[PDB]
Design a protein around this nucleic acid. Structure first.
Lengths: 200, 25, 96, 97, 91, 150, 127, 226
RNA sequence: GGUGAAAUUCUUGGAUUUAUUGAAGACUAACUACUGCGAAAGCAUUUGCCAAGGACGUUUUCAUUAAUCAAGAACGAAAGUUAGGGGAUCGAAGAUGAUCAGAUACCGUCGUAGUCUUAACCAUAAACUAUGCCGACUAGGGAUCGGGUGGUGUUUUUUUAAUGACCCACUCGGCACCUUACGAGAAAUCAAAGUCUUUGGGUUCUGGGGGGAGUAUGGUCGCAAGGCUGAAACUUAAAGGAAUU
């Protein structure tokens, strides 16, 4: 169900004679037998878990914490990463750029793995097959195949019914709509094919 | 008519002929 | 220049290739220099360094993998470490 | 016919010369074909010289100058009178005035 | 020594799915089923196990890589920038 | 000239007029002959044999000191190479260029120069096969050329 | 002796900025342009407008307490004209007339070493 | 333009100069003129700490102004505030720069411009990039009009210049580098080491920039060093 | 901000402007030239690696291996196509403000594709010097770039061998240029476009009035755009070149 590989990393328990196996999201270039260093004093290497305050501007990070201690929230899908844009040492806040282009302000103590996530370029291959889609979603969740609302009856969907398959009313739905009404383009600012760029 | 624009016009004519022929055959 | 010196010693002097031959010669005290490939395993490189420290030989680190070292020596296979037993006509031992 | 033996540029043995942009219209023109002129000017317009000198903190200040190289397309040079059309016989004069 | 003019490994899909989609799939399938150099042992023994897993069959080492290549251009560029930042920090 | 470039350079040896030369040479034809043989056994092509002879010894031309030229000496004494030296050096250059190209696929200049060098090799090989110093059906192949050199 | 600031003259076309900062360049004093001294858009870079701006800047900087200026001329630079506009000389002359002492004139027009791309297209501004 | 703003306040003044106050800027001991000028700053309120609101700022000063010598008019010096002591704020070296006038005056055609740059660190962990400029010159008695270098002389000159710069930085702290850079002895060093390759006039060391600097450095030594 | 003036646009939620930084991508200013290299297209930041190359020098070698080339090949600006990456700037399309009788143009501000790169295609340009390649000869002159040779000719080690950089005289090979007409040409002009009615050094390609027409058709190459090959019917007395007033 996950496009990114996972890495099992074994650490020594500092307070007891034990070994702790942590499950990491594998970054591209990480291999078996590699030494991972996690901490404030860790060095800027692929696979290390330095805090944002300790990494410099322009750093590529992944599995970044949204708050210090949440054990990774951002940039976890294959090929995705977070850019370190800046620092605010007063009330330590690192500004980052998210995979969607959004600018976020996170604490400087939030951890993150250096590098990009492995498994990148996955969606460049066409599935070619309802079979490949079936096998993909068979171990994600029951969300496929997708019947169109226009192909249903009015009892089953806002779009259903008619002597032709047509939506009938504007498919852009208000954010203040309710469940059963929110079917279509929810709170759409614009529609139609847009010639544009990342704009971020 | 500029020779470049006459060339473009002849290209358009050529591709329209090609389309019509391919439709008929 | 090191590739040219290695070709000259290949043509004129005496060499042997491979970890087992290199370690055996290091043991016998006959090796005069050992070239170690860049991508040799770190444990093997450490053991070769220890053997060469015990036997008072010189260690050179090739700027290339075992493929590059094999090409430099003149063989169509991979060599991880090559020990020069005598330069013959090269100046590989004399220069760095 | 051939107006100039040099084809209106300076390229023999090259084929291609990287272009520059005219300083007036920003037209792409090969560097050898441009009408580049080096403008070296005093900062103080040679009319405020005495005023600046007497209002300066330091005595006998050096008064630095500004340097730039103005690249001109043929159209802009002719319009701005950087060059003018000459007679056929003395187009061949390579010597600057 | 060539049984297909241009479909290559995508001859298994026959005439289906469209030529353009089969061409994209051909490119990524050649990359995904290719054999790569192992930077550790120096032999062409690195294969894809699953999307992201690249296992050398000789030195028994697993590597995290791209979905269809052992290493992506984005990964190489990120490694370059991280090296540059690391050396700026250290020196 | 320059079959494979646009160069028009004239640069060569001004062979002296005299054939019974050079009136300061007190060494003997046999001594020069055995020098030829010693250098050939040391493993030197006639080009460099003549170079070192003219260069360290006093040998104005082995042709005029002896009765014949260095390649003739080597062929008479069994030291003639399997393939002529010029074709050998062309093959060595082609092998070097091809080895460079395999790494540098993007070297279109190297591809062009390899085409030129291999054309020179094939022309020289055709001449040698016609004059029969190379056997018939001898053919330069890129796959076997590197092993052919050494 | 003299209290020193930086004149920071920006003599573009259609505008002229004259504004004295402190020596560090962080504290801004008397930012006056030609567009706030003239009405018509076409006169914003006129020498008269530049001079009125320089007189206003000199008045305000003298009121503050700064007595001398290190003069720093700048044209638009980058891919733009790079030749100082009609108002830079008027501004510096007006400062000298206003009598604030001057020292270390310099031209800080941003000069690219192989710029990005000049606007206007390949055929230029066909006017 | 004075009355053509259509909307200047979407929603629908105390004097900054009386709000502000003046400080005094002091260059390090490596320069002759200690005091270099003054700067404004908002008076420290309970939430702004004017000291820290002013500590990270730099000032450009002419080396002629710093040294009372008109022969340094074409050099510039960047001084970075690092400490504040009650209107006696002390600065440190940040980078030396030339004048645009000097650069464009030294650059002329019918001669060769040579540029080198090195990124060698000093003895006390200051990382700097030093840029050296050089120009081939015509020997006296030369009738040729250009006197260009042969692009191998250029590489030899660049190598020699880079060696000189690296050796002169590694072996001297930043204070020593400034003390040996004001008299520009490195220019003479390079000129001698290069005179065996090409005449090479106008060998002034161009800008040096401080890329990175070590830790706070705030307690016991720039009493002697600034 | 922008313009000939303007307007579109941003702007007390601080725009433009200032200083200190940071990131990204592109590019390689001045130096830069009647200068260099490459088969052409082209190629201008530094170092390292990898091969290659012209010219010069050679009293080295082989000995006619050579010149030009249907067929067949390699490379081949820009735009363009396919797919990743990249995506700052500029910017076919488009948006929008002017100007205008109109203005889906020039002008202005944005802006997708593109501009950069990887892989694969494309195979065209006023791809020009509108001048095929190889060889020989025929005027004068200076300058320049690369190599070489000879001058106790000038700067410091060493004001007391060296080297370097210059200055002289040659020489070979380049990019060119000035003068003139032995000549050539319709002329413009050309040291080749000369040595061609005193017609023959070798060889490849192309043209045969203007259009129709680089069209139709067939073939072949290409994903496509299109490339290469390529007519005729019909029509027409001029089109065209260089000069003169």
């Amino acid at each position: 169900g996950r496009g990114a590989p996972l890495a099992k990393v074994v650490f020594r328990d500092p307070y007891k004679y034990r070994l702790r196996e942590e499950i990491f999201i594998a970054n591209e270039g990480v291999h078996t037998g590699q030494f991972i260093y996690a901490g404030k004093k860790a060095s800027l290497n692929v696979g290390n878990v330095l805090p944002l305050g300790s990494v410099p501007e322009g750093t590529i990070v992944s599995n970044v914490e949204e708050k210090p201690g949440d054990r990774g929230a951002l940039a976890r899908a294959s090929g995705n990463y977070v850019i370190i844009i800046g620092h605010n040492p007063d009330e330590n806040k690192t500004r980052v750029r998210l995979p969607s282009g959004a600018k976020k302000v996170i604490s400087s103590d939030a951890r993150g793995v250096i590098g990009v996530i492995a498994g990148g370029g996955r969606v460049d291959k066409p599935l070619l097959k309802a079979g490949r889609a079936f096998h993909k979603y068979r171990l994600k969740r029951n969300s496929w195949p997708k019947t169109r609302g226009v192909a249903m009856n009015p009892v089953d969907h806002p779009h259903g019914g008619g002597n032709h398959q047509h939506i009938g009313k504007a498919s852009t739905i208000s954010r203040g709509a309710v469940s059963g009404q929110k079917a279509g383009l929810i709170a759409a600012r614009r529609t139609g094919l847009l010639r544009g760029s990342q704009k971020t | 008519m500029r020779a470049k624009w006459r060339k473009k016009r002849t290209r358009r004519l050529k591709r329209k002929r090609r389309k019509v022929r391919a439709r008929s055959k | 220049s090191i590739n040219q010196k290695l070709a000259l010693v290949i043509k004129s002097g005496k060499y042997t290739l491979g970890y087992k031959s290199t370690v055996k010669s290091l043991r016998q005290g006959k090796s005069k220099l050992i070239i170690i490939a860049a991508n040799t395993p770190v444990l093997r490189k450490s053991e070769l360094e220890y053997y060469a420290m015990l036997s008072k030989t010189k260690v050179y680190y090739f700027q290339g993998g075992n493929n590059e070292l094999g090409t430099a020596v003149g063989k169509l296979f991979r060599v991880g470490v090559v020990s020069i037993l005598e330069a013959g006509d090269s100046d590989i031992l004399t220069t760095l | 016919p051939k107006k100039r033996a040099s084809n209106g540029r300076n390229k023999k043995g090259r084929g291609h010369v990287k272009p520059v942009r005219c300083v007036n219209c920003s037209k792409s023109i090969p560097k050898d074909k441009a009408i580049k002129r080096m403008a070296i000017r005093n900062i103080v317009e040679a009319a405020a010289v005495r005023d600046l000198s007497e209002a300066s903190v330091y005595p006998e200040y050096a008064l630095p100058k500004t340097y730039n190289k103005l690249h001109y397309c043929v159209s802009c040079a002719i319009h701005a009178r950087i060059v003018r059309v000459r007679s056929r016989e003395d187009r061949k004069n390579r010597a600057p005035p | 020594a060539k049984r297909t003019k241009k479909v290559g490994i995508t001859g298994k899909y026959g005439v289906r799915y469209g030529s353009s989609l089969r061409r994209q799939v051909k490119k990524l399938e050649i990359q995904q089923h290719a054999r790569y150099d192992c930077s550790f042992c120096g032999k062409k023994t690195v294969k894809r196990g699953a999307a992201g897993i690249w296992t050398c069959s000789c030195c028994k080492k697993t590597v995290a890589g791209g979905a269809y290549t052992v290493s992506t251009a984005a990964a190489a560029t990120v490694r370059s920038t991280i090296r540059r930042l690391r050396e700026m920090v250290e020196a | 000239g320059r079959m494979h470039s646009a160069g028009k350079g004239i640069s060569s040896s001004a062979i002296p007029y005299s054939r019974n030369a050079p009136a300061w040479f007190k060494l003997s034809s046999e001594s020069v002959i055995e020098q030829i043989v010693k250098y050939a056994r040391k493993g030197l092509t006639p080009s460099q044999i003549g170079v070192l002879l003219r260069d360290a010894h006093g040998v104005t031309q082995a042709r005029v000191i002896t009765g014949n030229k260095i390649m003739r000496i080597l062929k008479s004494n069994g030291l003639a190479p399997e393939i002529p030296e010029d074709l050998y050096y062309l093959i060595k250059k082609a092998v070097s260029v091809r080895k460079h190209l395999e790494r540098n696929r993007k070297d279109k200049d190297a591809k062009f120069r390899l085409i030129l060098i291999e054309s020179r090799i094939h022309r020289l090989a055709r001449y040698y096969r016609t004059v029969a110093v190379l056997p018939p059906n001898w053919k330069y192949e890129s796959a076997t050329a590197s092993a052919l050199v050494n | 002796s003299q209290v020193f600031g930086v004149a920071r003259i920006y003599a573009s076309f259609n505008d002229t900025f004259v504004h004295v900062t402190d020596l560090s360049g962080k504290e801004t004093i008397a930012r006056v342009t030609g567009g706030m001294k003239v009405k018509a858009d076409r006169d914003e870079s006129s020498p008269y407008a530049a001079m009125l701006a320089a007189q206003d800047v000199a008045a305000k900087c003298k009121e503050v307490g700064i007595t001398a200026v290190h003069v720093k001329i700048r044209a638009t630079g980058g891919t733009r004209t790079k030749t100082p506009g009609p108002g830079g000389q008027a501004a510096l002359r007006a400062l000298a007339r206003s009598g604030l002492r001057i020292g270390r004139i310099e031209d800080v027009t941003p000069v690219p070493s192989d710029s990005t791309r000049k606007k206007g297209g390949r055929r230029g501004r066909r006017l | 333009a004075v009355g053509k703003n259509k909307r200047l306040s979407k929603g629908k003044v105390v004097d900054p100069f009386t709000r502000k106050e003046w400080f005094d800027i002091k260059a390090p001991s490596t320069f002759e003129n200690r005091n270099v000028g003054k700067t404004l700053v908002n008076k420290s309120t309970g939430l702004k700490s004017a000291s820290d609101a002013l500590k990270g700022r730099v000032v450009e000063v002419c080396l002629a102004d710093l040294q009372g010598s008109e022969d340094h008019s074409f050099r510039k010096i960047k001084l970075r505030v690092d400490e504040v002591q009650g209107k006696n704020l002390l600065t440190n070296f940040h980078g030396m720069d030339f004048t645009t006038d000097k650069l464009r005056s030294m650059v002329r055609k019918w001669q060769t411009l040579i540029e080198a740059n090195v990124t060698v660190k000093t003895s006390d962990d200051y990382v700097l990039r030093i840029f050296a400029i050089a120009f081939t010159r015509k020997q006296a008695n030369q009738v040729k009009r250009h006197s260009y270098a042969q692009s191998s002389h250029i590489r030899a000159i660049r190598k020699v210049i880079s060696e000189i710069l690296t050796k002169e930085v590694q072996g001297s702290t930043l204070a020593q580098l400034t003390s040996k850079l004001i008299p520009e002895v490195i220019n003479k060093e390079i000129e001698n080491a290069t005179k065996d390759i090409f005449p090479l006039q106008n060998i002034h060391v161009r800008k040096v920039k401080l890329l990175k600097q070590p830790k706070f450095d705030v307690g016991a030594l720039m009493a002697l060093h600034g």
